Design a protein around this ligand. Structure first.
Ligand SMILES: O=C(O)c1ccccc1NC(=O)N1CCc2ccccc21
Length: 134
């Protein structure tokens, strides 16, 4: 696999465990209902070693730019300010977040032309499936 196979615009088609994952991140019931309603686009750009992931929704647009392997300051959709590191390892893009003694791991890989986003926090797992637009 390659990091450049994840590149492009992707559109959400399936979601499993998003509510529980948001509950675990400390998200309020009101924001959880909104977040569950949204059907975002995920725009991935990869300059071989530089990475940008934009999440477009009519509700909220989020984005981060990093250099693979380097720890940067990331502001999340739910307003957490995290120290994040992104790494492309074993045919998957791994994003590890750290804030106020807590940790989360977002893994993005390709599976039958579809972008599979596995979000994990403690015992909680979420699976978001995206389909390519461009
Ligand atoms: O949605 C995702 O697959 C996603 C996966 C992993 C980490 C964060 C995510 N979500 C995200 O960054 N945003 C921004 C705007 C918005 C609206 C509604 C639901 C979510 C989001």
């Amino acid at each position: 696999a390659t990091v450049q196979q994840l590149e492009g615009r992707w559109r959400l088609v399936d979601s499993k465990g998003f509510d529980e994952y948001m509950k675990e991140l400390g998200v309020g019931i009101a924001l959880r209902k909104m977040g569950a309603m949204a059907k975002p686009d995920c725009i991935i750009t990869c300059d071989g070693k530089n990475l940008t992931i934009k999440t477009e929704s009519t509700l909220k647009t989020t984005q981060f730019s990093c250099t693979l392997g380097e720890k940067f300051e990331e502001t999340t959709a739910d307003g957490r300010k995290t120290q994040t590191v992104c790494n492309f390892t074993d045919g998957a893009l791994v994003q590890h977040q750290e804030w106020d003694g807590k940790e989360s791991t977002i893994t993005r890989k390709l599976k039958d032309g579809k972008l599979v986003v596995e979000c994990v926090m403690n015992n909680v797992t979420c699976t978001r499936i995206y389909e390519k637009v461009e």
